[PDB]
Amino acid sequence: WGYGKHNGPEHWHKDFPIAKGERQSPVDIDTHTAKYDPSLKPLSVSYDQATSLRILNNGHAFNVEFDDSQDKAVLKGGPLDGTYRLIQFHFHWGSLDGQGSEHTVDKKKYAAELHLVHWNTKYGDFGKAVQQPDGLAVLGIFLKVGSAKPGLQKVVDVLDSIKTKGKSADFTNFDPRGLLPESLDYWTYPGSLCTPPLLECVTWIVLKEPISVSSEQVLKFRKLNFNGEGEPEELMVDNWRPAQPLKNRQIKASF
Numbered sequence: 001w002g003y004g005k006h007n008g009p010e011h012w013h014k015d016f017p018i019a020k021g022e023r024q025s026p027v028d029i030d031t032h033t034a035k036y037d038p039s040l041k042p043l044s045v046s047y048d049q050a051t052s053l054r055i056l057n058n059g060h061a062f063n064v065e066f067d068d069s070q071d072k073a074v075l076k077g078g079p080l081d082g083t084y085r086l087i088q089f090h091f092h093w094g095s096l097d098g099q100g101s102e103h104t105v106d107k108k109k110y111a112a113e114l115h116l117v118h119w120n121t122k123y124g125d126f127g128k129a130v131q132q133p134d135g136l137a138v139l140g141i142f143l144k145v146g147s148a149k150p151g152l153q154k155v156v157d158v159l160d161s162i163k164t165k166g167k168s169a170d171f172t173n174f175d176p177r178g179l180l181p182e183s184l185d186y187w188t189y190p191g192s193l194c195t196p197p198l199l200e201c202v203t204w205i206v207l208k209e210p211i212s213v214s215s216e217q218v219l220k221f222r223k224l225n226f227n228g229e230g231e232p233e234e235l236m237v238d239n240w241r242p243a244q245p246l247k248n249r250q251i252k253a254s255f
C-alpha cells in the first residue's frame, strides 16, 4: 500500500477489507449538520512534560515519536473518558496548496493536516489500544499557507536528514505546544486510523481553528521521498486519503 496509482487508497480494500467499513476516516465536516453538544467538556492538553525522542521517514510520512512510558504528555476532557498519552504525530500534505488535508470543512481542503496520536492508558500499551473502540484519540489540526510557524521550524530543519525511507534522526526537547492554535474549539466523531490497518478504534477531535505556515515551510515537506536510498526518486506528496462516507454517524461540535 502507498498513495500511488497502483497502490493507492482506492486499492487498500484488497488487503484491508475494513477499508469499506462503517466508521472510516477522514470525512467531510458539514458545519450546518454538525450538532452543537452543550454536554461536551473543554479539551485538556497537558504537554508541558513532553519528551520527544526522534523523527523518522517510514516511506509514507515522517513521524516524531515521544516517550509514552509515563503520563508526560496527555490529553483528556472533551468527549474522552480517561487519559490518553501522546505517542507520535505526523502530517499529510499535498503537491499543491489547494490539497493535502484528510478532513475537509464544507468540502474545503487545507494545505496539510497534523495528527497527534494518543492511546488510552486503561489498555496498557498502544498495541492493545488499537483493538478497542475507544482505544485511540487523534487530535487533528489543519494547516493553511500564510505566515511562518516558529514552532514548526525545528521540524523543518531536520527534514534534510531523513530524506528517504528508513532514515531516522535523534529529535529531543521538541515542544508540541508550539503547534497548537489559539482556540481549542473542536468537532468530534468516532472513526478509524488514517492508514492501513485502518482499525476503527479512534475518537477524532478536529480543531476548528487552523495554524498558518509559510510557503517555504511546506515546500520543505514536499522535498521528502517515499523511496528508500539508492532507488528511483519518488517525491513524498499527496500522502492523504480521500473523504469517506459518514454512514449514519453524527458529528458533534463544542461550539
Ligand SMILES: [Zn+2]
Pocket: 090, 091, 092, 115, 194, 195
Ligand atoms: Zn494521519
